[PDB]
Amino acid sequence: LADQQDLTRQVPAEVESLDPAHIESWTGNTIGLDLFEGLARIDASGAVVPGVAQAWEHKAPDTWIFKLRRDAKWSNGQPVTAADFVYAWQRLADPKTGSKYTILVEFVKNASAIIAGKQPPGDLGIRAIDPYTIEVKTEVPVSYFPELTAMAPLTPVNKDAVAKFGDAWTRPKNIVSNGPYTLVDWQPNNRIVMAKSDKYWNARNVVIRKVTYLPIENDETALRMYQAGQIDYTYSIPAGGFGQISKQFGKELRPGLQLATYYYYLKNSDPALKDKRVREALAMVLDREILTSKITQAGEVPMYGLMPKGVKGVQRPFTPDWASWPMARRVDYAKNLLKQAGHGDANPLTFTLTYNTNDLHKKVALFAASEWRTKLGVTAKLENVEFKVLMKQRHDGKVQIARDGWFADYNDAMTFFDLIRCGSSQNTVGYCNPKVDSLVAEANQKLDDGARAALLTQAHDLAMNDYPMVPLFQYSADRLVKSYVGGYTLTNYIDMRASQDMYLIK
Ligand SMILES: [Cl-]
Numbered sequence: 301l302a303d304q305q306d307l308t309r310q311v312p313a314e315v316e317s318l319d320p321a322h323i324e325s326w327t328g329n330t331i332g333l334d335l336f337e338g339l340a341r342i343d344a345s346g347a348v349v350p351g352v353a354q355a356w357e358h359k360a361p362d363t364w365i366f367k368l369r370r371d372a373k374w375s376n377g378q379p380v381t382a383a384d385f386v387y388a389w390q391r392l393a394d395p396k397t398g399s400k401y402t403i404l405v406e407f408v409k410n411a412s413a414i415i416a417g418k419q420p421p422g423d424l425g426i427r428a429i430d431p432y433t434i435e436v437k438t439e440v441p442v443s444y445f446p447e448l449t450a451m452a453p454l455t456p457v458n459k460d461a462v463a464k465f466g467d468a469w470t471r472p473k474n475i476v477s478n479g480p481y482t483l484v485d486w487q488p489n490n491r492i493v494m495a496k497s498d499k500y501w502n503a504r505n506v507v508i509r510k511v512t513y514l515p516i517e518n519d520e521t522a523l524r525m526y527q528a529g530q531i532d533y534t535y536s537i538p539a540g541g542f543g544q545i546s547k548q549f550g551k552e553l554r555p556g557l558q559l560a561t562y563y564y565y566l567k568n569s570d571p572a573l574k575d576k577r578v579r580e581a582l583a584m585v586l587d588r589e590i591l592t593s594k595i596t597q598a599g600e601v602p603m604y605g606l607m608p609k610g611v612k613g614v615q616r617p618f619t620p621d622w623a624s625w626p627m628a629r630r631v632d633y634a635k636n637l638l639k640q641a642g643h644g645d646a647n648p649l650t651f652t653l654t655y656n657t658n659d660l661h662k663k664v665a666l667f668a669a670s671e672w673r674t675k676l677g678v679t680a681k682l683e684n685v686e687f688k689v690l691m692k693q694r695h696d697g698k699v700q701i702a703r704d705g706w707f708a709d710y711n712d713a714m715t716f717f718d719l720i721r722c723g724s725s726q727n728t729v730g731y732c733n734p735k736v737d738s739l740v741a742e743a744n745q746k747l748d749d750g751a752r753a754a755l756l757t758q759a760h761d762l763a764m765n766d767y768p769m770v771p772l773f774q775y776s777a778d779r780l781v782k783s784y785v786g787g788y789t790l791t792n793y794i795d796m797r798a799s800q801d802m803y804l805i806k
Pocket of ligand 1 (some may be wrong): 587588589602
């Protein structure tokens with residue numbers, strides 16, 4: 301081990317919140333999971349390992365038991381118990397809380413009714429049998445339920461701290477948390493600093509003593525800082541840079557694909573975008589082969605639906621008929637769709653295309669705009685905003701076409717269905733197809749995984765034929781991590797890599 305154990309990690313934007321109930325993003329989960337620990341954790345390899353729960357058991361199809369360790373503590377020295385989880389999950393489910401991430405608790409018994417305000421939060425199917433024993437009842441059987449409990453929004457929250465401090469409870473001077481690190485400094489758009497916690501039950505095995513998170517929007521600037529030794533661990537690499545970066549940094553460039561999809565949000569209540577024919581036309585004209593081979597260049601794979609190849613629970617991704625058509629044929633068909641929809645040359649379309657400030661996103665957006673102009677005569681005006689603002693605008697439908705992207709929360713197709721299920725808190729495009737939903741509910745009754753998969757595949761295909769959004773490609777996991785950073789693996793496919801699992805060598 302190295303004498304010094306400070307780690308500096310770059311994140312793509314200012315974090316939206318450090319309150320587990322309001323955490324929505326990759327950045328929020330990465331930072332929040334250093335500060336809070338749930339029933340389980342995802343380790344450096346991507347494996348689900350014990351968190352506050354030392355063990356768990358699938359006692360019945362709809363029932364899980366979690367046995368908590370007895371020495372889990374909050375940062376103020378108070379014990380962590382079953383009651384803390386009951387409170388946290390009820391709070392998450394309560395619509396008065398206003399969480400945008402109710403999807404994770406939705407599998408729990410009665411959660412839907414509670415979210416809808418039909419039943420009180422106390423009815424939620426999580427119970428403290430005793431201070432160290434948790435019982436969770438689910439609406440339907442979920443074989444992988446423990447994976448979900450490793451995400452930030454299901455971490456416990458300290459009732460007293462929230463009660464005493466209200467909206468200021470996550471401020472460094474007020475916050476109480478139970479993870480391997482405690483928050484020392486939070487300067488928005490500047491830095492977040494955290495220090496190893498001596499109260500964490502597994503402190504003796506936590507090597508990294510200080511973690512610094514720097515929000516840097518521009519990948520090139522991030523690269524410069526990495527090169528200067530200001531950063532040990534980047535978010536990604538600049539678009540089009542793989543070649544020169546590989547030559548200069550070699551194996552520090554950690555390669556792979558992620559279980560994550562890059563796509564354009566479409567406002568489904570838009571007067572034009574509400575027409576499936578318009579959405580489809582916009583989708584079929586974009587050349588994802590050129591996009592990936594010439595613009596992104598980091599191994600990204602063209603995608604036409606939400607399911608990345610390799611995700612458990614479906615048989616295969618969605619690949620539309622036209623994916624293998626000559627472009628000229630693609631364009632003719634798409635122009636005819638616009639005509640059919642009443643948006644021919646007599647009624648030209650203009651949209652605003654909003655993305656979060658970043659060089660890759662800008663490049664992708666410029667490409668889409670030119671593609672749509674030259675092939676369809678559709679005008680997309682580019683607009684860049686801060687990521688936090690973009691997220692809010694998508695929720696509120698204040699953007700028409702928007703840069704979006706989803707990282708799997710767990711390795712099953714269900715995580716991607718959170719984007720298109722009627723009424724889901726993360727269905728921001730506003731799509732609703734009851735047949736798709738009923739097919740999913742049916743799939744989740746199947747006793748056989750094969751049968752389940754078939755139905756989920758059918759439901760996914762059915763949804764994508766409606767083109768509720770525009771999938772572009774599968775995210776590349778490529779990033780730079782210094783040679784002296786140990787513990788990094790290439791098998792963490794959802795890219796949930798906690799600081800406590802790494803260590804500095806040399
Ligand atoms: Cl394509």
